[PDB]
Amino acid sequence: EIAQSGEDFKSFLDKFTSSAAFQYTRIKFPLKTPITLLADDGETEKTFPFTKEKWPLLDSETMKEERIEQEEGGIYVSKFTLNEPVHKVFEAGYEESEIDLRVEFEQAADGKWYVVDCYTGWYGYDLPIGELKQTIQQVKEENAAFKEIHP
Ligand SMILES: [Cl-]
């Protein structure tokens, strides 16, 4: 569960979520899994590299493990589904739905933690390819908000 050398994961994650500049330094772009969307033709899958300009900054609230029971009926669950000394995977989503976030963390040979892959519902398979550019701009605007409180 806990690494015997290098960076402590919980301490890393607190720094990662508290500073945008630091966060960007600890993501290995392009991520392992590219963004995959269906073309308008309705048959061809198109991939786009998951690069720095597309990254939605992750805050401390998002990275908390918890179970949210909503009055309107949903149960939203976030948890580390893999929790090994040098390899962790965080998943979040509504119970009985597909997940809307998966973040994969690995402690590299230098002892530092990095994000090496991510699935985010911002770029879900349900996103029309024609909306990708504007979605990326929306993420930029969210990131501007993040940077007002977590530079
Ligand atoms: Cl409730």
Side-chain angles (χ1 to χ4, degrees), residues 11-45 47-134:
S11 184
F12 154 80
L13 189 62
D14 285 346
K15 195 180 185 182
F16 184 89
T17 54
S18 78
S19 171
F22 179 76
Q23 182 162 147
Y24 282 122
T25 72
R26 295 306 192 81
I27 303 165
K28 289 182 160 330
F29 296 110
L31 298 174
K32 284 198 284 179
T33 304
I35 295 159
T36 302
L37 308 172
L38 252 203
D40 292 341
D41 80 347
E43 39 178 33
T44 310
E45 290 183 323
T47 64
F48 302 82
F50 200 154
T51 51
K52 183 188 166 188
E53 92 283 8
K54 298 187 185 75
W55 179 253
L57 293 161
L58 295 173
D59 70 16
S60 60
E61 294 79 6
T62 295
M63 296 300 317
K64 274 214 199 330
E65 293 189 279
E66 69 196 3
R67 180 180 152 95
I68 304 166
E69 283 170 321
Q70 300 176 327
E71 187 278 343
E72 283 167 353
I75 301 177
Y76 194 84
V77 176
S78 56
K79 64 191 170 162
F80 284 92
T81 52
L82 183 72
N83 186 22
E84 304 288 334
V86 300
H87 191 195
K88 301 191 196 293
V89 176
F90 182 82
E91 274 176 25
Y94 282 102
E95 274 187 359
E96 318 199 347
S97 292
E98 186 60 88
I99 63 164
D100 59 27
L101 179 67
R102 180 195 186 272
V103 190
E104 183 174 24
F105 299 93
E106 291 188 341
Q107 194 196 54
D110 63 7
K112 295 181 177 179
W113 288 97
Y114 296 86
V115 170
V116 299
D117 207 3
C118 175
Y119 169 77
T120 174
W122 274 108
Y123 309 119
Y125 192 81
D126 291 341
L127 185 69
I129 194 159
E131 294 184 359
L132 180 57
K133 189 163 245 193
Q134 190 43 41

